[PDB]
Amino acid sequence: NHLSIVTLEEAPFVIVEDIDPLTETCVRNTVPCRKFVKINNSTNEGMNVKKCCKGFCIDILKKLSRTVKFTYDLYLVTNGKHGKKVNNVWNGMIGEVVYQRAVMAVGSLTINEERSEVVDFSVPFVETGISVMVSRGTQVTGLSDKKFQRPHDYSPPFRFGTVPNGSTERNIRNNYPYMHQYMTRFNQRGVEDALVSLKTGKLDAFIYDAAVLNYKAGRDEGCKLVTIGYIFATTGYGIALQKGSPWKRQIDLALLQFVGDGEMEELETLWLTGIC
Amino acid sequence: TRLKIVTIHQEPFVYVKPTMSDGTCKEEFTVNGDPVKKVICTGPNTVPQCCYGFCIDLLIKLARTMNFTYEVHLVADGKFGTQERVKKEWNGMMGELLSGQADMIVAPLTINNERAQYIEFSKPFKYQGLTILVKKGTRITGINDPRLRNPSDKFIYATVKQSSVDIYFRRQVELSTMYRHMEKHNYESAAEAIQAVRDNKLHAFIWDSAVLEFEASQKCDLVTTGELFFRSGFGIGMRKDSPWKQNVSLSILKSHENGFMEDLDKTWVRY
Numbered sequence A: 001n002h003l004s005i006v007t008l009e010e011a012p013f014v015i016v017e018d019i020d021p022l023t024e025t026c027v028r029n030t031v032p033c034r035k036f037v038k039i040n041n042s043t044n045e046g047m048n049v050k051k052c053c054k055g056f057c058i059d060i061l062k063k064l065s066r067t068v069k070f071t072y073d074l075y076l077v078t079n080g081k082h083g084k085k086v087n088n089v090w091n092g093m094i095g096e097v098v099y100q101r102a103v104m105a106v107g108s109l110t111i112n113e114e115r116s117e118v119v120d121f122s123v124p125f126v127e128t129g130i131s132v133m134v135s136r137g138t139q140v141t142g143l144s145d146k147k148f149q150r151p152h153d154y155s156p157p158f159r160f161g162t163v164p165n166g167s168t169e170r171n172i173r174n175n176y177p178y179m180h181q182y183m184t185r186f187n188q189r190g191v192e193d194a195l196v197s198l199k200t201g202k203l204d205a206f207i208y209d210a211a212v213l214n215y216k217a218g219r220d221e222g223c224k225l226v227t228i229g230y231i232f233a234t235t236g237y238g239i240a241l242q243k244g245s246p247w248k249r250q251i252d253l254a255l256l257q258f259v260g261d262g263e264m265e266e267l268e269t270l271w272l273t274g275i276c
Numbered sequence B: 001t002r003l004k005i006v007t008i009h010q011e012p013f014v015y016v017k018p019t020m021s022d023g024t025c026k027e028e029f030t031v032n033g034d035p036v037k038k039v040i041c042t043g044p045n046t047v048p049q050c051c052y053g054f055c056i057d058l059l060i061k062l063a064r065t066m067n068f069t070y071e072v073h074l075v076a077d078g079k080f081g082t083q084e085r086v087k088k089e090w091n092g093m094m095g096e097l098l099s100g101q102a103d104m105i106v107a108p109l110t111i112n113n114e115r116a117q118y119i120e121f122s123k124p125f126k127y128q129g130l131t132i133l134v135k136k137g138t139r140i141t142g143i144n145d146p147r148l149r150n151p152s153d154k155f156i157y158a159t160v161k162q163s164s165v166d167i168y169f170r171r172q173v174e175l176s177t178m179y180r181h182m183e184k185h186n187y188e189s190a191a192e193a194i195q196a197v198r199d200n201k202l203h204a205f206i207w208d209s210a211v212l213e214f215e216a217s218q219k220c221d222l223v224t225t226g227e228l229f230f231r232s233g234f235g236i237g238m239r240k241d242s243p244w245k246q247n248v249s250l251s252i253l254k255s256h257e258n259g260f261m262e263d264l265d266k267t268w269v270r271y
């Protein structure tokens, strides 16, 4: 009943904060979450730092822990991010579940076919997929837009990219070979860097997870950045569990239970809705 | 060895038409010339009929993908399925799946807690929710409008009997007032309620947005009342010990990811 659970920071679903030096206890709506930090780069020596976590998914974990009746030891992944298969080996949150270092992974984890082959996913609890962010007024149909499909067919080519190594890049790689090969030049280290490139005119479009992009558009200063239309390859975030896990059954019923009772809408207005 | 598929009439996911004199389905094509795939589906009026649409194209894809043969029939009592006290029992497609009359449910079947306790749902093949259908001109705010929260015989509203919507309003104690009002007006099928709205016999129909949005796009005398609530999805239904459940879900995921699901949407909905 005491489970090792892995997560990853990505506002507003999971937000990390430093713990109080004088108390060493998490307060408010936060829960304890540790992170393994290296001492140097010449050794494997490291130490777990005690931090605090909050957000949409943390509230979901709290609800689940209570209703499903289990306790946990939440930790932040340090070997990769959400999950990528490299040389046939999974890293990130997915990897932590696959190699059994965690009973489940909770966070902004996108459910897709290749991941579902190595881990079990609960029903989706947050609707997402692939969206496109651009400055208001930009004319683009969606992913299938020729500006994306055949970039060099336009004088100044359209400049667009994603944050590599996630479900979004994996999808583009499999569906649009030319677009993907062209995009790498515009890879963004993260969402924050991407938004800055957009606002300053260094990028024309940013392709990424729909739920995060809608959240970002909802709080954009001046409401200049918006999502086009639309969601391609609709899916959702899901809790990843070990294949054949005994926890899946109760977890699914509880999540569906929350949706029907409106608990998901409350969390939605509490963490996701913005001024724009 | 041939899978028994049960479905239900519900445009644009499942259209149902009579076969031709010779017992076959009339050859039809989309606006631009693609062949409309049809399957012979038996059902009550028991006689052979023609079935096609979003869900039928999905079945054909799943069957070819997982390499299985099937036979399709329309649910005998014409309902989606709810659990009623008699001991409790399931009716509609839920009952047929649980009794062995069907091996798989392929329709716009809402995934919910109540049903998930007894059967296995695939990952959603369609994400949507509930909205309200009214006659153009009817002024309603949403599920929070006073005409709904503080009912009277002056403004009648309802949903479909033995449906996921019925389960939803009967489950939420805060919707008790609406539930009691609807219990006296619910229709046997979505088609009938929709027709009642056009004939001013029903003032508001609470149903799936995927269906109502489509109806509003085909009949300009009908419109949807803003604000989607009870966001939910449709999934394939199977018994918990079905050996096809893992591959069925993997196939749904694959279809969303490679654009197949979007093609069905362009073909049957967004048109």
Ligand SMILES: N[C@@H](CCC(=O)O)C(=O)O
Residues within 6 Å of the ligand: A082, A083, A108, A109, A110, A111, A163, A165, A166, A167, A168, A169, A208, A209, A210
């Ligand atoms: N939610 C994504 C990360 C962001 C993206 O690639 O869209 C994943 O689980 O990989």
